[PDB]
Amino acid sequence: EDVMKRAQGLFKPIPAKPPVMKDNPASPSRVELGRMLFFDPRLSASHLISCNTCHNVGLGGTDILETSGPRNSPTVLNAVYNIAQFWDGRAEDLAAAKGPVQASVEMNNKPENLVATLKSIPGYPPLFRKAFPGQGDPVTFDNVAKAIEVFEATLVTPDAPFDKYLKGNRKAISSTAEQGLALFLDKGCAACHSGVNMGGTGYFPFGVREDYKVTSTAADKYVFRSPSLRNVAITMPYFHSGKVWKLKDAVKIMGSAQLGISITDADADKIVTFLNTLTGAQPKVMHPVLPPNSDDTPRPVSN
Amino acid sequence: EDVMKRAQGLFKPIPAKPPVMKDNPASPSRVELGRMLFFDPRLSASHLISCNTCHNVGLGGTDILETSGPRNSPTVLNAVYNIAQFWDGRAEDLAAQAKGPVQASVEMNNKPENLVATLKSIPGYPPLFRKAFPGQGDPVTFDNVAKAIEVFEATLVTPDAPFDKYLKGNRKAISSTAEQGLALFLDKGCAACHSGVNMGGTGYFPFGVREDGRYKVTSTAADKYVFRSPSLRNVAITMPYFHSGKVWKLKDAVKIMGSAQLGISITDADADKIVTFLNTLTGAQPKVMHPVLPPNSDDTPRPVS
Ligand code: HEC
Ligand code: HEC
Ligand code: HEC
Numbered sequence: 140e141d142v143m144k145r146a147q148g149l150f151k152p153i154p155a156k157p158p159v160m161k162d163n164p165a166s167p168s169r170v171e172l173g174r175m176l177f178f179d180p181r182l183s184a185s186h187l188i189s190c191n192t193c194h195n196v197g198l199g200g201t202d203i204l205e206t207s208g209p210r211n212s213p214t215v216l217n218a219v220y221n222i223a224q225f226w227d228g229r230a231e232d233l234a235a236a237k238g239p240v241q242a243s244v245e246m247n248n249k250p251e252n253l254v255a256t257l258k259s260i261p262g263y264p265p266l267f268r269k270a271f272p273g274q275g276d277p278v279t280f281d282n283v284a285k286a287i288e289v290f291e292a293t294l295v296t297p298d299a300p301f302d303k304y305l306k307g308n309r310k311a312i313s314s315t316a317e318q319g320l321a322l323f324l325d326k327g328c329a330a331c332h333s334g335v336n337m338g339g340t341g342y343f344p345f346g347v348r349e350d351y352k353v354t355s356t357a358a359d360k361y362v363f364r365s366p367s368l369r370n371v372a373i374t375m376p377y378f379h380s381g382k383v384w385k386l387k388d389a390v391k392i393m394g395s396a397q398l399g400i401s402i403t404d405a406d407a408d409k410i411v412t413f414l415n416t417l418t419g420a421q422p423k424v425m426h427p428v429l430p431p432n433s434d435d436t437p438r439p440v441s442n
Numbered sequence: 443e444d445v446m447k448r449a450q451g452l453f454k455p456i457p458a459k460p461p462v463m464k465d466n467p468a469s470p471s472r473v474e475l476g477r478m479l480f481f482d483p484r485l486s487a488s489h490l491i492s493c494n495t496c497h498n499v500g501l502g503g504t505d506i507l508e509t510s511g512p513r514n515s516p517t518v519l520n521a522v523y524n525i526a527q528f529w530d531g532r533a534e535d536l537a538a539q540a541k542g543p544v545q546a547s548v549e550m551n552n553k554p555e556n557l558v559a560t561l562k563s564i565p566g567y568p569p570l571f572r573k574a575f576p577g578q579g580d581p582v583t584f585d586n587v588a589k590a591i592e593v594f595e596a597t598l599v600t601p602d603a604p605f606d607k608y609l610k611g612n613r614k615a616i617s618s619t620a621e622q623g624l625a626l627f628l629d630k631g632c633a634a635c636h637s638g639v640n641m642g643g644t645g646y647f648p649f650g651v652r653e654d655g656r657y658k659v660t661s662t663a664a665d666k667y668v669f670r671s672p673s674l675r676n677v678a679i680t681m682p683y684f685h686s687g688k689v690w691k692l693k694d695a696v697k698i699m700g701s702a703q704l705g706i707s708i709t710d711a712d713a714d715k716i717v718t719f720l721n722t723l724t725g726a727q728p729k730v731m732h733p734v735l736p737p738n739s740d741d742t743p744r745p746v747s
């Protein structure tokens with residue numbers, strides 16, 4: 140199959156094994172701690188919002204809201220395979236500081252309040268000494284993000300029917316889905332939505348905006364990340380703004396004159412059918428049991 | 443006309459003003475320190491090699507050699523507008539920081555702590571680090587060396603290429619043949635990968651040119667490597683081409699990029715028009731004063747060989 144072979148050139152399947160992070164080695168106790176932090180709403184100043192609120196592991200790693208400039212929450216699933224870390228920005232700033240964990244935390248908290256709160260919870264410091272042995276002061280923000288990152292690295296979705304197809308089985312997806320794939324290649328979609336994550340590799344001067352929703356940029360210095368399409372069927376709504384609710388409308392907008400690509404409604408349906416093959420196996424995550432406040436834990440602040 | 447409006451969609455001209463670096467504010471003394479360090483060969487263990495050796499401001503910010511796995515040196519000119527920092531790697535690793543390009547370059551020829559100890563042994567350096575990073579007890583550090591350099595790098599931009607005058611409205615700034623090259627570049631789909639203010643350097647793609655004058659071809663990286671699609675600004679003057687530097691002639695690099703593997707075929711006539719367009723992307727080359735560097739003391743480490 141030409142189509143299969145062309146697919147195997149542009150994409151690779153998600154490995155079952157969590158990828159190693161260089162300079163952040165995974166260990167049981169570090170992965171455990173990262174899981175606790177991920178579900179602990181005390182990392183928000185109000186004590187109500189955890190990472191799981193906006194990146195819900197039960198809803199495709201996102202929260203099925205438009206936004207929470209406001210942005211749609213991208214999935215945490217397979218985010219460890221994204222090269223491009225942010226929805227949009229100017230070239231120079233995406234080039235030259237804060238990564239996504241820190242940025243996310245600052246949405247509803249201050250790093251220093253976060254760390255002072257963790258220190259006030261007697262169960263946390265012993266877990267940080269186990270997870271970061273050797274350090275005199277292991278409860279720090281950088282260590283919070285390290286622990287969370289080794290947990291996020293286990294939030295991968297191997298075994299999507301498309302991945303079975305990449306590994307050699309032509310029958311793992313329906314031939315309607317195969318027609319959508321063929322269309323996805325020939326129309327040019329794959330140039331931007333490529334590699335092991337089927338996107339997340341780069342930025343383009345191409346946002347979807349209003350004035351109806353259309354692809355555009357005026358000569359404007361902002362560029363947008365072309366997202367991974369993995370699990371796109373269950374991470375609605377779509378695009379940086381979350382303004383477009385249906386996958387089919389998303390596919391149709393992407394059939395813009397501005398990126399080459401003309402597509403019929405019939406083409407769209409086949410493409411959607413193909414995009415439906417990219418839903419992998421969803422991680423089964425245990426809700427952690429969190430250590431209790433002390434009398435000295437800071438009070439919630441409503442915002 | 444229409445070809446113009448499409449080009450204004452995809453590309454953006456280089457600003458004349460150095461871009462502001464988040465958390466790395468430019469100041470006259472930080473810029474001056476960064477220029478000194480850039481031209482100081484004592485940042486290498488041999489004391490012979492400076493940033494300017496591999497990224498020569500005289501030669502389009504590169505060194506016109508294949509390689510110095512070994513990689514061709516990308517230009518420093520406008521590098522402040524590259525989002526993608528490296529030639530290639532796996533997705534998960536490019537996602538992480540194994541250090542940025544300054545640290546990694548230094549590691550080609552030296553160790554960071556030897557660099558720092560060398561700078562402290564040069565009496566004229568510590569005071570300049572004090573002026574450049576006020577309020578810090580110990581300002582001579584590896585991170586401060588990179589910060590000083592980066593604000594110096596931020597001045598190494600090339601505004602006013604003929605193509606940028608065209609972006610700004612003037613259709614006569616490039617030849618009508620250049621304009622046909624432009625039309626081709628867009629229509630064959632080149633611009634999706636070589637877009638924005640830097641006309642590339644925005645992303646990684648699972649295509650590298652490999653050993654197959656067409657011994658070289660685009661081939662997929664079903665191993666798990668992706669390659670940066672580079673900025674094509676000043677491409678006419680930063681030969682040889684591709685991550686390995688193996689293709690010397692621009693026109694050959696263009697033909698190679700006419701790959702069916704990327705849904706593209708171009709005639710030889712086509713290639714020539716595209717080359718003509720690419721030649722419009724050379725900007726004004728920065729005029730950089732070679733610094734006068736402070737002298738060793740008697741305790742400055744010896745060169746190694
Ligand atoms: C708890 C501390 C966490 C963790 C570990 C992460 N998040 Fe969020 N997140 C939110 C939004 C709107 C974005 C998009 C920001 C933008 O691009 O402009 C993010 C982004 C991320 C990422 C990047 C994922 C990727 O595509 O590579 C990651 C890894 C990440 N977050 C992890 C929104 C929120 C919230 C809504 C209020 C909350 C709460 C969090 N995030 C918290 C966390
Ligand atoms: C071929 C016609 C396609 C198809 C079927 C899709 N794409 Fe793209 N894509 C690009 C960018 C920069 C974005 C983000 C835009 C924004 O957020 O404002 C997108 C977004 C999508 C989505 C939304 C998915 C989500 O998780 O929100 C979908 C379903 C989608 N694309 C499918 C970039 C590009 C390109 C770069 C030039 C090209 C070509 C395409 N996309 C083409 C297509
Ligand atoms: C002196 C300290 C410097 C500075 C400030 C920089 N360089 Fe180099 N450089 C070299 C090579 C082969 C590469 C490519 C590496 C790869 O991607 O695999 C680099 C890369 C850079 C960059 C990134 C540029 C970009 O495209 O965005 C930058 C900003 C950079 N360098 C700055 C080769 C060498 C050398 C050859 C021996 C020497 C000496 C240096 N570099 C030194 C420095």
Ligand code: HEC
Nearest residue numbers: 632635647650651669670671672683684685695699700704
């Ligand atoms: C349309 C026909 C074109 C033209 C005229 C060019 N490109 Fe690309 N390009 C891409 C990548 C990933 C690379 C680096 C590959 C490697 O080094 O192994 C390139 C490289 C080039 C160059 C060399 C520039 C240099 O400084 O060395 C040139 C002149 C060039 N390209 C022109 C990526 C892509 C794409 C991604 C899918 C597409 C499409 C194109 N390029 C198309 C074209």
Ligand SMILES: [Ca+2]
Nearest residue numbers: 374375376377
């Ligand atoms: Ca979404």
Ligand SMILES: [Ca+2]
Nearest residue numbers: 680681682683
């Ligand atoms: Ca070169």
